[PDB]
Amino acid sequence: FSELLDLVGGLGRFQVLQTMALMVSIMWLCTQSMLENFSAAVPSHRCWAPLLDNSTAVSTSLSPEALLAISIPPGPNQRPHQCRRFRQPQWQLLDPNATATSWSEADTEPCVDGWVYDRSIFTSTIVAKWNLVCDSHALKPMAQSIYLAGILVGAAACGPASDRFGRRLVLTWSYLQMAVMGTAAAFAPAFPVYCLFRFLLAFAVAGVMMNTGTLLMEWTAARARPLVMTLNSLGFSFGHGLTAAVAYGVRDWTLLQLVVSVPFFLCFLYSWWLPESARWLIIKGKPDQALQELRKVARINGHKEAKNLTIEVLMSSVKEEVASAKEPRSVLDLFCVPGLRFRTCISTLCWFAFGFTFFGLALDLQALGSNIFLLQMFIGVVDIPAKMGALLLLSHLGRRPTLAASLLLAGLCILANTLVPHEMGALRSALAVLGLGGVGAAFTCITIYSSELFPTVLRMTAVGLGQMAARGGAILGPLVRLLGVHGPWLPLLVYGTVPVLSGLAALLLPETQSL
Numbered sequence: 001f002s003e004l005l006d007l008v009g010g011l012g013r014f015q016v017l018q019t020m021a022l023m024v025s026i027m028w029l030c031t032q033s034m035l036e037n038f039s040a041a042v043p044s045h046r047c048w049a050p051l052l053d054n055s056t057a058v059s060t061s062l063s064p065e066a067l068l069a070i071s072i073p074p075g076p077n078q079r080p081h082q083c084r085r086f087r088q089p090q091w092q093l094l095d096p097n098a099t100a101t102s103w104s105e106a107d108t109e110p111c112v113d114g115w116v117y118d119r120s121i122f123t124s125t126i127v128a129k130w131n132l133v134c135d136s137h138a139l140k141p142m143a144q145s146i147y148l149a150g151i152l153v154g155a156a157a158c159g160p161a162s163d164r165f166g167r168r169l170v171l172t173w174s175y176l177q178m179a180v181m182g183t184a185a186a187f188a189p190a191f192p193v194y195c196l197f198r199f200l201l202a203f204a205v206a207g208v209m210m211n212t213g214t215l216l217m218e219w220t221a222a223r224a225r226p227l228v229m230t231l232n233s234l235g236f237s238f239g240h241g242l243t244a245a246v247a248y249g250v251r252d253w254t255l256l257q258l259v260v261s262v263p264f265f266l267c268f269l270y271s272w273w274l275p276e277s278a279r280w281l282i283i284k285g286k287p288d289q290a291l292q293e294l295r296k297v298a299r300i301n302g303h304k305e306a307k308n309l310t311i312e313v314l315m316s317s318v319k320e321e322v323a324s325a326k327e328p329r330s331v332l333d334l335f336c337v338p339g340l341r342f343r344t345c346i347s348t349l350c351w352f353a354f355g356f357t358f359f360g361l362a363l364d365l366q367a368l369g370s371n372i373f374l375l376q377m378f379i380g381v382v383d384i385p386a387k388m389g390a391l392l393l394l395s396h397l398g399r400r401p402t403l404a405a406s407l408l409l410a411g412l413c414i415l416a417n418t419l420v421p422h423e424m425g426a427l428r429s430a431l432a433v434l435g436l437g438g439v440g441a442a443f444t445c446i447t448i449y450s451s452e453l454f455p456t457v458l459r460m461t462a463v464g465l466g467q468m469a470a471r472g473g474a475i476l477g478p479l480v481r482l483l484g485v486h487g488p489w490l491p492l493l494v495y496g497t498v499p500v501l502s503g504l505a506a507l508l509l510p511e512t513q514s515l
């Protein structure tokens with residue numbers, strides 16, 4: 001194919017404008033995923049109680065702390081209980097000479113009159129809107145899991161649709177569906193409906209992710225291909241900073257979700273000016289249309305020499321791409337061939353570990369430190385040098401030790417985050433950020449390494465199995481957070497163990513750098 005790109009301009013003005021226009025969309029797409037650090041933040045809460053919250057009642061000489069001690073019992077964290085209140089005011093508990101033995105569990109009841117939430121950091125969140133607290137606490141990670149399951153299902157459906165209807169067309173309607181479903185999620189009347197619209201938004205997020213990369217590849221000359229994939233990966237890095245920036249100003253979840261959805265109407269509009277992939281058009285037997293796309297790009301780049309092109313030139317020079325129909329393959333082939341079974345297991349486990357760990361940790365920054373805006377910013381700022389350093393080390397040291405050391409760095413940081421005492425918020429934040437940076441670097445490594453462990457006809461199938469394994473592990477990510485009932489050490493121990501085990505396994509792969 002490359003001769004046509006070289007005749008049309010393989011890295012010209014068009015490819016520059018296209019890379020910029022697609023990176024910007026990836027930034028906003030990243031905000032959509034990271035949003036529920038803020039859209040679903042848990043403000044501190046207690047039961048509603050007459051002496052505290054009945055604004056029409058007669059006043060008293062008591063201070064707020066006195067009334068609070070009189071009305072809500074203490075919880076383990078030296079703070080008011082989040083799910084109980086006293087059945088009758090405990091006037092006897094006001095004196096400092098009182099004892100915890102002065103009252104019994106029968107003197108307490110759950111929040112019959114509902115909850116009261118701290119509005120000082122966020123004006124509203126879904127947790128406050130639908131009372132996803134106490135007995136209902138599981139519903140937040142369930143919502144996150146449903147979104148990530150949407151990404152898995154959407155990626156499964158994207159393949160057939162992208163091959164049958166075209167790269168740009170599926171990208172276009174994915175942008176529109178993201179806009180519409182995000183806007184609808186911002187105004188959902190009930191929690192089940194919010195879950196449904198987040199699922200249908202994720203279904204489109206998968207399409208944007210897949211077709212952005214594909215449509216960059218099929219218009220980029222091979223000399224520039226690694227760089228363009230790297231820029232695609234930096235899109236998410238800047239997306240984290242953008243999430244912090246937008247969420248710092250917009251403290252209301254409805255307006256926040258709306259603000260991050262509205263851009264995709266603009267993405268939808270300008271996706272009509274992109275050209276459809278010329279490889280796909282010729283492979284599907286439409287060289288007369290592919291000729292128009294090629295001359296369109298040439299017009300943008302300025303290559304008047306495109307006057308040389310004809311459908312005969314295209315059909316003569318792209319037959320080698322058309323010939324790919326000869327050799328089908330399937331996922332089971334990876335496991336049948338005796339030499340490829342072991343590589344497949346270890347590679348898939350590494351993809352899984354990326355997805356599981358990242359979407360386990362990066363969606364509860366409120367547990368990792370005291371300021372989630374700075375945490376959300378720093379997991380971008382540190383992620384940039386992590387990705388770039390991965391590309392350096394993966395060239396100097398080979399694939400195997402870079403992948404292994406990246407995953408081991410991640411796992412040992414996340415595990416150390418169980419031992420550092422909760423008083424030391426700064427050090428805990430630092431270890432969390434570095435642990436996430438290691439996982440990003442591991443993503444870079446395993447993306448490249450999985451493209452080399454396999455023979456050329458099974459390369460695509462192996463990378464596909466890997467990507468679906470990562471998407472599948474992300475589903476289990478949030479659900480492991482429910483183990484926090486036994487103390488926050490346990491979710492962190494699990495999220496820390498998985499990358500250590502997969503990193504150790506990665507040492508058993510064969511090295512693939514040219515030696």
Ligand SMILES: *[C@@H]1O[C@H](CO)[C@@H](O)[C@H](O)[C@H]1NC(C)=O
Pocket residue numbers: 050054056057058
């Ligand atoms: C609130 O206080 C007023 C005071 O007159 C009282 O009539 C009303 O029943 C109280 N309501 C609750 C829910 O405490």
Ligand SMILES: O=C(O)c1cnccn1
Pocket residue numbers: 236237238240358379380383436437439440441
């Ligand atoms: O996708 C990203 O930009 C990323 C990945 N791992 C850690 C932090 N950021």
